Amino acid sequence: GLEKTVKEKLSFEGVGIHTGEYSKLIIHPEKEGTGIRFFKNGVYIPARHEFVVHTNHSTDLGFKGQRIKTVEHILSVLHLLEITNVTIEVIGNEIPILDGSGWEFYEAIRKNILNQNREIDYFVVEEPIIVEDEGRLIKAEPSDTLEVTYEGEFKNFLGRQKFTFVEGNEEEIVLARTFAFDWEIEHIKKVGLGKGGSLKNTLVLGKDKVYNPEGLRYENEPVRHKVFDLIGDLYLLGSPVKGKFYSFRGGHSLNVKLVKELAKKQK
Ligand SMILES: CC[C@H](C)[C@H](NC(=O)c1ccc(C#CC#Cc2ccc(N)cc2)cc1)C(=O)NO
Ligand SMILES: [Zn+2]
Numbered sequence: 001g002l003e004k005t006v007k008e009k010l011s012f013e014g015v016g017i018h019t020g021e022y023s024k025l026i027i028h029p030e031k032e033g034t035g036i037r038f039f040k041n042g043v044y045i046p047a048r049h050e051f052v053v054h055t056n057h058s059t060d061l062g063f064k065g066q067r068i069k070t071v072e073h074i075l076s077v078l079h080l081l082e083i084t085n086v087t088i089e090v091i092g093n094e095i096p097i098l099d100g101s102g103w104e105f106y107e108a109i110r111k112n113i114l115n116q117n118r119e120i121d122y123f124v125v126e127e128p129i130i131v132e133d134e135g136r137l138i139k140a141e142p143s144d145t146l147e148v149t150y151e152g153e154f155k156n157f158l159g160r161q162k163f164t165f166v167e168g169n170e171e172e173i174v175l176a177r178t179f180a181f182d183w184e185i186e187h188i189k190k191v192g193l194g195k196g197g198s199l200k201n202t203l204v205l206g207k208d209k210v211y212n213p214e215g216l217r218y219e220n221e222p223v224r225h226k227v228f229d230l231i232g233d234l235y236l237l238g239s240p241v242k243g244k245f246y247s248f249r250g251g252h253s254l255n256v257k258l259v260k261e262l263a264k265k266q267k
Contacts, residue, residue: 003084003116005029016094020195023092030085032118039089040066049236049259055252069094076232077105080170082240100177100201125243131258136249138258143244150226150247157208161220165227176224179203
């Protein structure tokens with residue numbers, strides 16, 4: 001496809017899932033060739049792997065002492081819509097979690113797409129590659145389209161699950177919420193994560209139940225969300241991606257490890 005930006009400024013506001021702090025986003029149009037970058041306190045922070053500064057339960061970006069937490073969801077939506085040139089101005093310390101999924105971002109941005117002149121410079125996976133970490137694995141291989149599978153194993157009623165995204169089916173993942181398990185709640189709070197979490201923005205799972213009043217959106221919503229996360233982390237390659245991906249129990253750390261190896265292999 002062709003490069004894209006937004007037709008006009010868009011803003012989003014709300015609590016961040018981990019900080020519990022209120023923040024605001026303003027998405028600014030940019031011309032062809034600009035790329036995706038964040039902006040905070042006078043500092044531009046490109047949405048690229050070189051600027052990743054944390055990968056524990058979220059992907060955080062930083063530069064010159066300016067940090068932005070949890071970029072993976074907004075990046076995933078921008079990757080799926082192939083928005084290639086914007087500046088995401090951030091006031092605060094974290095991207096708002098909103099409903100827990102990509103939906104509100106997706107809905108608003110989809111309505112405001114502006115086509116540009118330049119052909120997208122896709123990052124094309126050119127040969128098989130695999131990264132591993134003690135029973136976690138991500139592999140990639142060449143493909144003309146973006147296809148992403150995540151397979152997980154959960155110590156509850158979900159059991160082993162997997163989902164495959166194929167180009168054109170973004171509605172099957174953009175509403176999958178971020179999630180947490182009830183037995184991990186005490187820990188994540190002790191280490192200061194999930195301070196903004198609630199049943200209004202997080203799928204909370206138990207041994208044989210879901211805490212949320214509305215329950216699961218899909219029987220395999222958590223692995224759908226993991227696919228959504230991986231597509232967000234893949235956009236740290238610096239442009240939309242063409243390849244077939246399989247992640248077994250991968251997290252943001254392994255996701256970014258894959259991106260870094262792909263970048264290193266290309267050069
Ligand atoms: C690694 C992938 C993972 C899914 C990740 N999400 C998280 O790490 C995560 C960790 C903790 C929470 C939380 C909370 C809470 C609550 C709460 C609710 C109701 C009551 N009554 C009380 C408390 C949410 C998300 C993610 O999406 N990354 O992109
Ligand atoms: Zn996520």
